[PDB]
Design a protein around this ligand. Structure first.
Ligand SMILES: O=C(O)COc1cccc(Cl)c1
Length: 297
C-alpha cells in the first residue's frame, strides 16, 4: 500500500532519493525534430523537447512541429496531450492542434505571469466582444462565458474553422493558485479541480485527448495526469494496493521527458492519490468536503 510507503519515505525523509532513482530509470528517446534549427523559435525551453515517437504533428505541409506529446495510458484507456505554454509566435499552432486532435478541454495550471516573468502568451480572449483571429492557421476564438472560483476559472470558448465555418465548444479549465516548481495549497483544491475536469466530459473517450499545459508542460502538468491515471486504475481494480505510482510515472516518462520536476511534486502526487482514494473506494460525501476545504466560494 502507497499510504504505508508514504509514511516510510516521509519518516526516513527519502523523497529526494526516490526522486533520483526515477530520474535514473527514466526513458531517453531521440528528439531530433525538436532540435532542427528551423524549430528553435517553436520551443520555450532549450532543455524540454518532445520525443519524436510521441510528438503531435500539425497537419500543415510547411512545418508540422509543435512542442506537444501524446501520453497514451493503455490500461486506463486515457490519453493526454502535454504541451508548453504557447509562445507569441505559436498561439495559432496551439489552436490548430486543439482543432486537429478534436480536444474538448484545455487544462492550464499556471498564471500568465509568475515570479515577475511571462510564463505563457495570453492565448484566449479576455472579453466576449473582442474575439481573436489567428491569421496563420485560419481560426477564430470567441469567449462565450467565464465562471470564476477563488483559485480557478472555467471558460466556455467557441473555436471556428474560418476555412469550413465549422464551430466547436472548447472548455478552458484554469487552475489559478499553483506556483512553478511548487505544489497546490492542499490535495483538496487540486482534487476538486480534477473532478470538475472529469465531470465536463473533457477526459472521456468520445473526445480527442485533453490538452494539459503549465510553463514547460512537465511539472504541474505531470502531477495532473499522474493523479488522474492512478485514480482511474485504482477505480478499475478497486484495489489501492495494486497501484504503484512510481511505475505509472515511469510509463508516462516513456512519452514525455521530465514529468514531475521536483521531489515535492512527487510527494504531492502521492498525497493527491491517497486522499482521492477515499472517493474511489465509495465515500461519495468526501467530494463535498473537498469543495468546502478548497473555499472555491
Ligand atoms: O511545471 C513545473 O512546475 C516546473 O517545470 C518547469 C518549468 C520551467 C522550466 C522547466 Cl525546464 C521546467
Amino acid at each position: 500500500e502507497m499510504e504505508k510507503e508514504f509514511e516510510q519515505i516521509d519518516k526516513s525523509g527519502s523523497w529526494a532519493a526516490i526522486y533520483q532513482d526515477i530520474r535514473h530509470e527514466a526513458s531517453d528517446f531521440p528528439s531530433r525534430v525538436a532540435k532542427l534549427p528551423k524549430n528553435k523559435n517553436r520551443n520555450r525551453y532549450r532543455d524540454v523537447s518532445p520525443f519524436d515517437h510521441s510528438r503531435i504533428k500539425l497537419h500543415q505541409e510547411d512545418n508540422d512541429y509543435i512542442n506537444a506529446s501524446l501520453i497514451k495510458m493503455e490500461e486506463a484507456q486515457r490519453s493526454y496531450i502535454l504541451t508548453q505554454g504557447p509562445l507569441p509566435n505559436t498561439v495559432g499552432h496551439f489552436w490548430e492542434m486543439v482543432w486537429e486532435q478534436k480536444s474538448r478541454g484545455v487544462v492550464m495550471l499556471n498564471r500568465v505571469m509568475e515570479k515577475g516573468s511571462l510564463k505563457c502568451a495570453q492565448y484566449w480572449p479576455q472579453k466576449e466582444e473582442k474575439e481573436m483571429i489567428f491569421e496563420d492557421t485560419n481560426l477564430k476564438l470567441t469567449l462565450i462565458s467565464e465562471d470564476i472560483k477563488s483559485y480557478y476559472t472555467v471558460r466556455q470558448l467557441e473555436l471556428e474553422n474560418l476555412t469550413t465555418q465549422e464551430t466547436r465548444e472548447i472548455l478552458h479549465f484554469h487552475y489559478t493558485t499553483w506556483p512553478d516548481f511548487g505544489v497546490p495549497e492542499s490535495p483538496a483544491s487540486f482534487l476538486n479541480f480534477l473532478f470538475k475536469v472529469r465531470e465536463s466530459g473533457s477526459l472521456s473517450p468520445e473526445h480527442g485527448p485533453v490538452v494539459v499545459h503549465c510553463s514547460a508542460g512537465i511539472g504541474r502538468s505531470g502531477t495532473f495526469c499522474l493523479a488522474d491515471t492512478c485514480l482511474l486504475l485504482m477505480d478499475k481494480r478497486k484495489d489501492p494496493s495494486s497501484v504503484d505510482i512510481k511505475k505509472v510515472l515511469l510509463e508516462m516518462r516513456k512519452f514525455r521527458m521530465g514529468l514531475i520536476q521536483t521531489a515535492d511534486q512527487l510527494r504531492f502526487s502521492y498525497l493527491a492519490v491517497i486522499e482521492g482514494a477515499k472517493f474511489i473506494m465509495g465515500d461519495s460525501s468526501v467530494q463535498d468536503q473537498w469543495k468546502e476545504l478548497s473555499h472555491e466560494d
